[PDB]
Enzyme design. Sequence first.
Site, mmCIF file in Angstrom:
data_model
loop_
_atom_site.group_PDB
_atom_site.id
_atom_site.type_symbol
_atom_site.label_atom_id
_atom_site.label_comp_id
_atom_site.label_asym_id
_atom_site.label_seq_id
_atom_site.Cartn_x
_atom_site.Cartn_y
_atom_site.Cartn_z
ATOM 1 N N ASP A 156 0.822 -1.187 0.000
ATOM 2 C CA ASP A 156 0.000 0.000 0.000
ATOM 3 C C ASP A 156 0.864 1.248 0.000
ATOM 4 O O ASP A 156 1.926 1.248 -0.609
ATOM 5 C CB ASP A 156 -0.935 -0.064 1.208
ATOM 6 C CG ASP A 156 -2.209 0.659 0.999
ATOM 7 O OD1 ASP A 156 -2.180 1.908 0.955
ATOM 8 O OD2 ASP A 156 -3.243 -0.015 0.948
ATOM 9 N N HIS A 192 -3.433 5.952 3.858
ATOM 10 C CA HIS A 192 -4.236 4.809 3.455
ATOM 11 C C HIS A 192 -3.632 3.495 3.939
ATOM 12 O O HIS A 192 -4.351 2.644 4.480
ATOM 13 C CB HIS A 192 -4.353 4.860 1.939
ATOM 14 C CG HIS A 192 -5.270 3.852 1.378
ATOM 15 N ND1 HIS A 192 -4.777 2.669 0.914
ATOM 16 C CD2 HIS A 192 -6.568 3.894 1.031
ATOM 17 C CE1 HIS A 192 -5.770 1.959 0.375
ATOM 18 N NE2 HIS A 192 -6.843 2.688 0.450
ATOM 19 N N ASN A 232 -13.968 0.101 -6.078
ATOM 20 C CA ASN A 232 -14.982 1.050 -5.647
ATOM 21 C C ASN A 232 -15.712 1.684 -6.820
ATOM 22 O O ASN A 232 -16.016 2.873 -6.792
ATOM 23 C CB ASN A 232 -14.334 2.183 -4.858
ATOM 24 C CG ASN A 232 -13.776 1.738 -3.530
ATOM 25 O OD1 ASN A 232 -13.943 0.605 -3.098
ATOM 26 N ND2 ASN A 232 -13.162 2.669 -2.805
ATOM 27 N N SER A 255 -11.035 -1.023 0.010
ATOM 28 C CA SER A 255 -9.739 -1.017 0.639
ATOM 29 C C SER A 255 -9.813 -1.282 2.137
ATOM 30 O O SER A 255 -8.849 -1.709 2.707
ATOM 31 C CB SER A 255 -9.035 0.336 0.436
ATOM 32 O OG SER A 255 -8.496 0.448 -0.848
#
Length: 279
Positions: free
Chosen positions: A39, A69, A161, A224
């Site tokens: 990530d 994130h 998403n 996520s």
Amino acid sequence: AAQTNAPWGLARISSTSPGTSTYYYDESAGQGSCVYVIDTGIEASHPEFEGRAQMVKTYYYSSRDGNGHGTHCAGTVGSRTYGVAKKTQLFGVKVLDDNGSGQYSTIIAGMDFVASDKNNRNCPKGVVASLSLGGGYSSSVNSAAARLQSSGVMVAVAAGNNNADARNYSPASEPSVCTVGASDRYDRRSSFSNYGSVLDIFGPGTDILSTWIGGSTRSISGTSMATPHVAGLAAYLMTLGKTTAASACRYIADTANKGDLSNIPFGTVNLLAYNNYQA
Ligand SMILES: [Ca+2]
Ligand SMILES: [Ca+2]
């Protein structure tokens, strides 16, 4: 063990029903397992990680998570307060820049890195990789995720998403990994969650509280956020000896809450990750 007033998602994965507040889990808590969070990095110094997080690779100038994130996702895997597997080891691989973006070649390299690096770590209960990322379909991205799984890592990836079929996104569309859609606290598919035959499982993804950079916390939403719930659950079940990296996704689907979610398009699994914990 029982964590009272847990984030809703943690409560949800230890309940057959929505709307509870206590996360019930075996105290082994993923001890002896390892989870690579691939990530924007992990702020390992965050107190919530209790020294169990470390950066192991970056593809950028720094290993710092300048975005948040990755720290968030890591916290859902294994932070004390916000994590599923509160005693796992977290390894950060920074394939995304501080804007949250990354090139597929870099993401692929990060997957290959984990497949190798795990051979250098003491992870007696097994190895998981959480990939809260993705973009348009790429056979090379999918192939990298497949290789990582094949190498003996339980790979969990975000469905995406786009409120669309995950078949058009990668690594979501790689069949051999665990592709994770998002749900909300009312057991609806999250409005943004991708769907489709390639989904293996849903996890909590709307309004998920977790760690953030600057030693902070925040709630955000996404596939996520669902992905690390599944990654953390796999780590927890592997520590219990209930499953293996190769079989964990299937085990999780097997043992999931079935039929609880709404706005699941026909042909998408109606399966919500559940730890089946019995005191
Ligand atoms: Ca139920
Ligand atoms: Ca799959």
